[PDB]
Amino acid sequence: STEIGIIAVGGYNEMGRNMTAIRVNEDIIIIDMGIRLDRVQIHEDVDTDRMHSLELIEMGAIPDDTIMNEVNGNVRAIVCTHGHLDHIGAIPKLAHRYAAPIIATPYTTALIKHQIDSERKFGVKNNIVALKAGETLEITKDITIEFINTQHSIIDTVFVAIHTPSGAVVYACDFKFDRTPTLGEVPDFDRLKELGKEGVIALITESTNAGRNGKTPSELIAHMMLKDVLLGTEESAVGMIVTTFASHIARVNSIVQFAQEMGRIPVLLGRSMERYVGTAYQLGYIDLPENVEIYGSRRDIDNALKKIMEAGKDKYLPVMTGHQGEPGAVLGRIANGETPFKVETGDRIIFSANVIPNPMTQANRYALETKLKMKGARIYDNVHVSGHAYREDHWELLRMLKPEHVIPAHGTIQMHSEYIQMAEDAGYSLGDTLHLLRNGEELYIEE
Amino acid sequence: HHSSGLVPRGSHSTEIGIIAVGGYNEMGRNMTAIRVNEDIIIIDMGIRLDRVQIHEDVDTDRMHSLELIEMGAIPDDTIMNEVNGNVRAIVCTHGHLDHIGAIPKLAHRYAAPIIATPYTTALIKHQIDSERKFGVKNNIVALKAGETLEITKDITIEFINTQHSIIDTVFVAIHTPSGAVVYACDFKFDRTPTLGEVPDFDRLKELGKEGVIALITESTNAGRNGKTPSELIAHMMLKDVLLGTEESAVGMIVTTFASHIARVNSIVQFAQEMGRIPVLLGRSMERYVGTAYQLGYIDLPENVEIYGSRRDIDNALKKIMEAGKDKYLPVMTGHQGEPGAVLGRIANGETPFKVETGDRIIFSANVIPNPMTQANRYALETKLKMKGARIYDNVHVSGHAYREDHWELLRMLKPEHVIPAHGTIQMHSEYIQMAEDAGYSLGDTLHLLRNGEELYIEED
Amino acid sequence: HHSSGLVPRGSHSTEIGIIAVGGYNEMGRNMTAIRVNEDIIIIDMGIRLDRVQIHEDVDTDRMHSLELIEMGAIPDDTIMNEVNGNVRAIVCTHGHLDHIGAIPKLAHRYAAPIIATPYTTALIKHQIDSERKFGVKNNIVALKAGETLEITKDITIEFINTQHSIIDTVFVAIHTPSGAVVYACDFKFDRTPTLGEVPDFDRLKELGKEGVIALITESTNAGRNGKTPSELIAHMMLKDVLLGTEESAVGMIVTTFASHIARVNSIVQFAQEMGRIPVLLGRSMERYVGTAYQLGYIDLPENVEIYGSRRDIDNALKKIMEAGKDKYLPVMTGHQGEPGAVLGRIANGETPFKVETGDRIIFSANVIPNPMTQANRYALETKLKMKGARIYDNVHVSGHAYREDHWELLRMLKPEHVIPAHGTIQMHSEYIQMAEDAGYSLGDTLHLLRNGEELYIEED
Amino acid sequence: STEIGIIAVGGYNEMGRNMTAIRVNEDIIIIDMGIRLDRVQIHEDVDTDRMHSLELIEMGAIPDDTIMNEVNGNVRAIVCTHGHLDHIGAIPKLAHRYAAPIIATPYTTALIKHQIDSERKFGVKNNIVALKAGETLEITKDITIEFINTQHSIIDTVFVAIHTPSGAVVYACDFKFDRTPTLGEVPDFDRLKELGKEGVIALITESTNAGRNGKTPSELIAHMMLKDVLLGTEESAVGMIVTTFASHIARVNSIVQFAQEMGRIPVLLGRSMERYVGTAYQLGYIDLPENVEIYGSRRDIDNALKKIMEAGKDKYLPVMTGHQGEPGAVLGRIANGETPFKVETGDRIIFSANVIPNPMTQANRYALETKLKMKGARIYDNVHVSGHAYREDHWELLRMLKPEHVIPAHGTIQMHSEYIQMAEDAGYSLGDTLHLLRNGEELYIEE
Ligand SMILES: [Zn+2]
Ligand SMILES: [Zn+2]
Ligand SMILES: [Zn+2]
Ligand SMILES: [Zn+2]
Ligand SMILES: [Zn+2]
Ligand SMILES: [Zn+2]
Ligand SMILES: [Zn+2]
Numbered sequence A, D: 001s002t003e004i005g006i007i008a009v010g011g012y013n014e015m016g017r018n019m020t021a022i023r024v025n026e027d028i029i030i031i032d033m034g035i036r037l038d039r040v041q042i043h044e045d046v047d048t049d050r051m052h053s054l055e056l057i058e059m060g061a062i063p064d065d066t067i068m069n070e071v072n073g074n075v076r077a078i079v080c081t082h083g084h085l086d087h088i089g090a091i092p093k094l095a096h097r098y099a100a101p102i103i104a105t106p107y108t109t110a111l112i113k114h115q116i117d118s119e120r121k122f123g124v125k126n127n128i129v130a131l132k133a134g135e136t137l138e139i140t141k142d143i144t145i146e147f148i149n150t151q152h153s154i155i156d157t158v159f160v161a162i163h164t165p166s167g168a169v170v171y172a173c174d175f176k177f178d179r180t181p182t183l184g185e186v187p188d189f190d191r192l193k194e195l196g197k198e199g200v201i202a203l204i205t206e207s208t209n210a211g212r213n214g215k216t217p218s219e220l221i222a223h224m225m226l227k228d229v230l231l232g233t234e235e236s237a238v239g240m241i242v243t244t245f246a247s248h249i250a251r252v253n254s255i256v257q258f259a260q261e262m263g264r265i266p267v268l269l270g271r272s273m274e275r276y277v278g279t280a281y282q283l284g285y286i287d288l289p290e291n292v293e294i295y296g297s298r299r300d301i302d303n304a305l306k307k308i309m310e311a312g313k314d315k316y317l318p319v320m321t322g323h324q325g326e327p328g329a330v331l332g333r334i335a336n337g338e339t340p341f342k343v344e345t346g347d348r349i350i351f352s353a354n355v356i357p358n359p360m361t362q363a364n365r366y367a368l369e370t371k372l373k374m375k376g377a378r379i380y381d382n383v384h385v386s387g388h389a390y391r392e393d394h395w396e397l398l399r400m401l402k403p404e405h406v407i408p409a410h411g412t413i414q415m416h417s418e419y420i421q422m423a424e425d426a427g428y429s430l431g432d433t434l435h436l437l438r439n440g441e442e443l444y445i446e447e
Numbered sequence B, C: 001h002h003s004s005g006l007v008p009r010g011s012h013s014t015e016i017g018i019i020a021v022g023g024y025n026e027m028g029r030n031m032t033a034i035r036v037n038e039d040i041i042i043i044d045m046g047i048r049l050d051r052v053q054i055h056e057d058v059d060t061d062r063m064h065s066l067e068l069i070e071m072g073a074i075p076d077d078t079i080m081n082e083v084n085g086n087v088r089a090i091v092c093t094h095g096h097l098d099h100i101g102a103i104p105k106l107a108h109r110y111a112a113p114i115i116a117t118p119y120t121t122a123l124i125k126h127q128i129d130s131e132r133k134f135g136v137k138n139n140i141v142a143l144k145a146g147e148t149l150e151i152t153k154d155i156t157i158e159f160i161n162t163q164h165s166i167i168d169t170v171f172v173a174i175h176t177p178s179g180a181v182v183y184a185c186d187f188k189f190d191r192t193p194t195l196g197e198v199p200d201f202d203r204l205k206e207l208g209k210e211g212v213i214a215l216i217t218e219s220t221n222a223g224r225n226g227k228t229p230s231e232l233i234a235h236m237m238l239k240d241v242l243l244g245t246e247e248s249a250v251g252m253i254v255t256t257f258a259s260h261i262a263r264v265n266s267i268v269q270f271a272q273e274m275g276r277i278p279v280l281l282g283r284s285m286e287r288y289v290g291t292a293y294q295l296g297y298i299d300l301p302e303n304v305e306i307y308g309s310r311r312d313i314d315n316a317l318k319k320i321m322e323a324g325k326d327k328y329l330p331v332m333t334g335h336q337g338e339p340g341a342v343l344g345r346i347a348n349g350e351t352p353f354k355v356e357t358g359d360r361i362i363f364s365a366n367v368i369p370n371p372m373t374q375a376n377r378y379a380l381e382t383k384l385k386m387k388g389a390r391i392y393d394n395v396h397v398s399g400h401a402y403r404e405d406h407w408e409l410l411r412m413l414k415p416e417h418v419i420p421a422h423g424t425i426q427m428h429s430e431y432i433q434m435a436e437d438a439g440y441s442l443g444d445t446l447h448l449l450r451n452g453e454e455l456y457i458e459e460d
């Protein structure tokens, strides 16, 4: 027989810190190892590289994988859905304890490798393997892992399908059914219906926005709103700063496109930006006009900003990090005047990002925005679209994959509750064919 | 013995008065009066459909003005017995009921013509050809955007094109010997509309530099941060939910504001795009979109069917049920869960249409933030969900201006005074903070008026 | 060749089952079944008055069980055709309709006696002497707090005193050969009540140490932080608003839950204290407080007047209007803005009572967090405010237990399993987090059940 | 004639930073000078004594009184309602610019004098005068200032009535009609009705809780709830910490009373506590049992806490500051483990205070509470009653004083909006007999 087990290690009580392990008989396939970036800020300057794994488990921070000492099997892989820190962030801190390769899609593999180049001299290390969407990699005789293309607030994001002798186990945390994306190709629907007909034993999926009604707005909407705010203005020569996730890439591409269309020169600031968009351009996921400038260290940035100041803000579009009000982020540094560029009345600050619903980040962004307003700035908030799927996206996902079991992951118990109600609309039953797991719990499927 | 100091004095003219009679304590029931010394211009006369439904039965028909004034409902113009002048005109911004709803009930007491843009005028006369008073009269005058009409020698009225949740909507500029008084309730700076013309920015700048004595403007979304999304966004989202689906042949009902001609036009475009026959239900839509098509503001495929009375609707809806929902797209009223509206009674099954599991109900409208309509819409959605429907909420974009749109409006008109209208005191508070950023001062250059109040501006 | 390891095995008995049939997806409509192998004990059978009013007309009278099951309304006991045992009793926690409301409609299909505490039993028989089925029968048995009743040799039922928003309310403990199953829906640890006895802590500790196999308990306010305020707080606040006023002779109406005997007792004490004659209106109050006084749970001054039918009420209310509101204190129903309740129709003026400016309306009740009742209460308060009334909101204290009260409940009973009931999945989620702090584990030692679901505990 | 002017200097746009000036012809009476304690925390360690007035005005922080250079009169007094920092906090920083005495009720005068003993070597200084409730002090021939007793979250809090040739101008920011107080005497109602009949030209009053329905709960309610939580527990020997406003005094008195009734020894920790309750006991506003201990510096506190730890928490009730999660406050220091006393599972933390509705303090209190919960603590939140008046308290205030004009103060424009609606119920009219002022604006009353 094939006894499948699903062990919840991280992120089913919280949003960050995601880690799941799928045990097929005695083989283990681990998916995702993220940091929880909120409850690290509760403590007074931690500097995550000064701490080793255990420290951070009693903060968590990183998922408590000690519970993996109680499970009956050996891990053969560490798969990663995409390159957000809530998914690949814990790798350089925990993956070394496992004698297993790290499988990911190219952009992720690259960014992982870049992050480990800060773990220490080496680590152990695991060998890092790049697998693209649409391709499949056999890990043992009968266990084979497949990558299926999807969209998310990061480029190159993927469904993972673990084929076993008794069927496929697909895990889909962090997706979005964007039918008209700015980057990448539309999600592989035909493959989802087909693989649905092949046989899915279990579905593990995010419940982030399952309570939200309807279907997720396309990234094209964010594109159009940003177009509207940048170009559709009767105060053309003001001085505009755009801030967003350094990781989003699709949007940054939209923004530099816009800069080329609105006759400004796009300058990208911050280590964050340099890493993500740099790695993106180098690996050819985005094209850049020859005029763009990218600066990471404080000297490059501040120099670029004195320059950008005295030559005229009207003829520039700084694109940067700091949308959640991170002090030390370039925007936080501009708001505090710890920079040559010092904003004046009329100046437009464009936040192409949501406010993360945590008191820490909300306080930070509050303080940031008031400092900006006292310096006369005019703020455009939340010109943004969520990269997570809504109720209807989930509904149709259930209707094409037709999974035999469903396990909500990547969220709080309330998010999970919303998802549960939706799945119950689909014919499922709690504790029977629909399962609510907590961090540290293992659910068995038989036969 | 000595010491000095010097100040220039004079010299002296125009006593302008602004009468807040309706829609300054609440939204809707809007009425403002612009008094230029001796002469008066009435702007907007709206109905408030909110605090009439709180009472057990609405009627609104065989009732005369006074009763609705103790409900309000209609603006209390009794305070106009206290003003020193005669109204020589009644202008209307656009054809929403919070703006023209009180006309067939109050405009008759005033010996003045009603000036509006063609579509508005049309809907006005259609409403008077329905209240049935027949009547003591007014001339209904059609003035299009971009044109100007002299009414009293020194008083001249200009229409300046803008966008809003209904087609053909306009800024009104009351030119006086000492400058312009601009009234801009219900507007939005949509630079990429689906219908109509882009708002006339250049004229706004010109008129700004000519001299604006006062700006009267809505504060509905002045608290909302940033700039209002284009209607194109609503178009793209609707396009996304109707076409972008992997459960294609289900049976889909779309509900929206009957007045939002642009949105319904987008929708029939979509039905034409998805091979369903667009059918429009409700007396209300036949009213609005019928008037729109007759006057040629929207183009319609001949595939369209429009039905107003219950018999036409219930039978067309038999037509669609028995023939198959798959090749049809009903667009309807009832988005606020109005009982008696076609959708609410469909939800109650008081109709041939029997909605089934999987069916998609698409609300291209927001929930009006009032406990009544929130309750009705709650009940509606639970009936629909229990009968298995799949609900797409708030596929919608606000037709009102945000903080930054107001910012640039102030920066183009550069008015000497500012008056928030069309909202609650809190909405007005947000607007006040915004204008305070713009250099204005409360009780001096920016004024918070309440219903029934007059501020005198003495300008030379 | 070698190596070792050792584990003790066995030995083996009691298969206990817990049936969640009602009130696990919503609040109210509560029904749970405790199956001890072969025998079944039904606990609570409540009505849900929420999702019945969403439909146009309530009736509830000439309807039989099934229809109300597709509304629910009443708990779906159809799933009891699938269980392997016979119910040999029906216990009721207290006399709120979310607990005993479904009895005259479902208890008849079960060949079992209905066990309750005296006041509850009384109200039950009063309700069956009203549904009018006459009927196929059950014996209505009065078991007081602190006493125990053997029903099936190994199954014995204990009543343990507690406090709650209605007088004489009880923990139920189902003793079995292998331990106790405690059901505690609707409770509160009030250590200083105005009425009743302080909850029986010592017995809870004893029974905790004896062995509790399962705890089934409400999660209504498990999300609320801290510990529930005593009823004494509600008493002191009411004392504060009624007596503590510098506008003394106005005319004051107090509205509250008819079931909240303790609160009304406080109020009549106050009327007796402020020299007004306490008059109680509504069929509902005559029901509850009448039953309370007849059975001697509350003492009443002979000044009191209690009127149930419209004629008595409208005339007593003529009495009070024409004689002067100043020397009277009407206590009434209608706090949720129920149209047809005496207060709502007073607000509509469908009554001799004509409330005037200055008059005080005192709501000793919370707003039930549902859009329907929130809308009704909105409308009520606006009618009252427009007619000049002065409104005192939420002079109230919740009758349900908070997080910390639950904490100590777990720490006294030390149950082997925990099951949240009586709430939504989110309420249950909060409770789950609380119990997880207590050492419990989801799907192992703490179970989230939905309506219609059974968890088997196999205990030796 | 007598032309009265009311100049709004601070706190009508915000809550903190209160300052009003009443000009009677050419004489000026200033009431309140507070700090805004929120928007000082937006900046990175300010240390308010390192900055002089102007610094803080461009932060504000302290009220911008530069606008007082444009008014036609000379100030003859600086009156203070009570000893909260939103009322007397700006005195040592601005009062030196004015050649005028500072009048207050004894507890305030004391605490003011204690605060100036940190302004510098001296300052100028103004002479500080103690005037009790019920007594009157003539400041010029015809202008005389009266103190009328009321309750508020601080002991000895007062209505100020400025009698002039044309009537009284009463300012009542921060009150509460507590008819059954724990401390002090019930508000002087008879005097309010009487003085109402004498003639009030203008009423300046707080709008903090005017939107809140009904009448403010008595302090007796907070007393009873605290009694219930401290005594009504079936886990008697756990270890309980009580945190509250060091300034409240009434509640601290309740708490030590309770400690005496529940057989624990009351220990009070923090500079804040020592100052406020110490000054209170010394001036005889509260009685203390002989057993109590008060410790202010880190050494006394930490020593007391090691002591209190090893001897047994069961036999102790630490009462302290830190309810808004101030890092450096004793509770914040306990939650971070920067103290000998280190909380364990079951321990009860009792917050007898509300959460101040500002993102800064909400974030701070968030972080605090999560640290406490991770250490196993069980939290009792908001066992508290607001010290501000509600709609009905305001209503009856209007009905006994019968003021000819009303000006809401001490709040945001929305609070002011709520108050406006209530006053309109009372017959008043905006811009005519009811006035909405902003910071920096002067309103004239004639005749
Ligand atoms: Zn992600
Ligand atoms: Zn994620
Ligand atoms: Zn409109
Ligand atoms: Zn409008
Ligand atoms: Zn109950
Ligand atoms: Zn209940
Ligand atoms: Zn205060």
Ligand SMILES: [Zn+2]
Pocket: D084, D086, D087, D174
């Ligand atoms: Zn204060």
